Symmetry: D2
Subunit: 253 residues, 4 copies
Amino acid sequence: EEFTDKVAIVTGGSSGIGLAVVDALVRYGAKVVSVSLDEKVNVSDHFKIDVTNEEEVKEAVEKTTKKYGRIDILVNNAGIEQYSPLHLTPTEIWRRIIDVNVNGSYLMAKYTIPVMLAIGHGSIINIASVQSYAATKNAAAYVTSKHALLGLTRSVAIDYAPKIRCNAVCPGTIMTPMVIKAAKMEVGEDENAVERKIEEWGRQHPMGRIGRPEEVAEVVAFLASDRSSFITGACLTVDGGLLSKLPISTPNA
Amino acid sequence: EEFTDKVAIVTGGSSGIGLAVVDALVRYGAKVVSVSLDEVNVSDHFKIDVTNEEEVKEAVEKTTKKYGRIDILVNNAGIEQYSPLHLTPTEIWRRIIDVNVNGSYLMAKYTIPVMLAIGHGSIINIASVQSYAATKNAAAYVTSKHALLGLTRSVAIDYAPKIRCNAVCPGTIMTPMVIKAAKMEVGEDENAVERKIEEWGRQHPMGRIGRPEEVAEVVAFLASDRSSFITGACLTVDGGLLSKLPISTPNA
Amino acid sequence: EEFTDKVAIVTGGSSGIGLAVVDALVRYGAKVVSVSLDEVNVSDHFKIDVTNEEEVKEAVEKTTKKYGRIDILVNNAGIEQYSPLHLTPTEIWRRIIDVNVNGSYLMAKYTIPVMLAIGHGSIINIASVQSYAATKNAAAYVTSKHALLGLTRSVAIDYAPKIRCNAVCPGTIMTPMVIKAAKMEVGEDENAVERKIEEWGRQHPMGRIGRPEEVAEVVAFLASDRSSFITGACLTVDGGLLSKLPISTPNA
Amino acid sequence: EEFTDKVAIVTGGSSGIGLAVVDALVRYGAKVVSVSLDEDVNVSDHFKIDVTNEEEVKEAVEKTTKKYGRIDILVNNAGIEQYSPLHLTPTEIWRRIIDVNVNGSYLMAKYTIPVMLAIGHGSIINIASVQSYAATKNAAAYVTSKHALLGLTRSVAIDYAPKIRCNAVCPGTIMTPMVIKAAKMEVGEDENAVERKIEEWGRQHPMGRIGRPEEVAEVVAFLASDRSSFITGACLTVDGGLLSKLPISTPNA
């Protein structure tokens, strides 16, 4: 319990990832304030707001600071997806993904940084993706917004060291309801096709499975912790080896 | 003669880099359609804001109507504000992302189906060494240049083999943007400006700063069939800056 | 209490970094087998050369006959000489590649099948920020730390899920190698040295160089079940060094 | 034209890639010296030497300079492969691959560099691999040596700028007689199995085909040319998009 007296804010807090991050941070002693589009745990407070709405972000951050007196940790985890290549992505959907996934993070960080400066220490963990380094097909706005998020990461880390560390977590496929929905979109519903498809994505990760939301949450907690006190501006992949794998088969002398 | 009968669109075509690119391409025989905020040796100029969907659509349809092809798109429109993230005003943050990322989305959006319909294209995003690492007080800029690499990788992967999409990541290049950055740091004092530039030059292994035409040659190579198995790549044109660790060493 | 009953081997075990990894793993309850040329309450010590296959084979087989397991291997034996490439004597170049790269091949070669037979392992290679970017006059060292990333990635990919393999890439850390490096540039002069250290620290966004324990926490995290979906990764522990572009920018 | 009166040394000169580099540099005007273990008269001189034998390297560089007065361009392209994971790679095989692939390049560079500093300019091109960034299974010594080559590349670039530029070319699968051998090793010879397998590898690259040796040579020639006068210490992929591709299927929305 090393996060005792520390306050954490976590966005997309009713996500698979978000919920696991909330649970991991409460388990290590923090008070967690959760932010999401729903009313949807062990959070000390929940804010139902749109991270792209500046007045809403500002009010939430100020109510938190007023009530708890401090914010030590921000986890930017809010993010949406459109499965379209670029030229097939309508303008409002493009702008909206870049707005949610990039500007939402900027806005949270913008209002949260002053308090962390005031207080002397802070830790900002940006939940990005393996799509921050490489691209799947049909993910133009998503891949671009996750690349952005590392730039956002490296900038904050450079401008605010040593008081604030800022790092990115880059997950491969993580078991969440989104993953189920995507399988269902791709293959439909003949006998166990949905499950076989989730198992197949697992088989492309060198680990031969997909990740659990708590395995992401453990990495977030470590970055939030004094344990990682010389890591900042880093982009840690949690992807079961995916990004280091070349998918060219090879004989076996 | 290499680009004879090929049509290239380049945005930010009054730029240090845009202008040099426009010229290499003209020199190598391309018909160049220049795009910028201003009013040059090109075949067509559109004075338009790349963030204006209507103006982009119109410039791309006119070009297509007139030449019946677009072989090459160079996305080079870019703005730079100087602020750390929490001191960046929201409207300024939103505008930089809009210009540097959405303007590229928009040019590509109308250009890609033309290239697919016709057989072949080459798209080049002018990104930056700041697509890999940050300077101080450049939050929106750094974010948007990292974003461009993603747009690049995405386009490459969805549109191979017909469309090749690559990024050129320059270091400090001698351009009006760079001269201006120096005065904002050092005053309009002619003499201090050159001292500032030469200091940036000495941060680069090459010991000088780049010329816009050295960037334009790399854009030319990427637009060319010579780079026909290159796509989704980020080519640094940085005199070695990114491979340099700035910690001194005994020379012994 | 997390590593109770687990067996760790750490090479370069009286290194600054080596020593802190040793204490950290001991303090989280591991049985630690130290490897070095030297002589900390480890459970065993081997005074061997990692480039000597016989000695490596001996240390690894005694260990597994003794404990019936090797859960954790930390490759950290690492030498350095200063010389640019063409001025590096052949024997010294070969020696640095041998220790830094083959020493790791050898330890892993004997440890892997043990981990595979028993069910599980974590291997952590201590590489460097010089696995990504170069300093001057460090040809052999820079090439050898890049090689270790390839060694890491290969091992990760051939042996998942049962073995996780990852690299830690430290920035400037307060160790004996680093104090020596400073003396080699600056002299024995006591606070000339610490001026040089301060100058390095100032190159890192954090404003100071790392402590060996900051490295060992990262190694502990990677040896641990907490990082169970992490493999083939490079974790920089560099106070932001690699994410920083060393080019000044205007204020406000 | 551009290389008229220039001299280039290319190692592994009777390989598919080496052969196409030699032809490309001759087309652009160079006098080209080949180095290989073997016995192509595009070349104006050929040295049947082992790049790991310092005295041979020294003698060949020395004979080249006395003949031509100059070496403008060095292409390190000597490489051997073994298809084994680390723990199945015997010690002599491991040391020999690191030796040829890393030590061979060090040696050539070691003797060419003072020639290049004397004449005042040089361009060094290291033929590395997509295996310089990520890994196939069963390729431990090879992946290690190709990562090493990038560090060799960055060091030379850092220490010898502005007079000597040093860059790396990172090919994906290139049609070579080695690719035929690897396919043969992997599937054997039932009907067109071997050709299908080379075709399957092509399908893994976003380009949907493998590369031609000449497409690698074009990039080497650009890197040797003054056209790339501000590129140094860069590692340029020629891989049909392979390294930018995530192999996780997605739906189309």
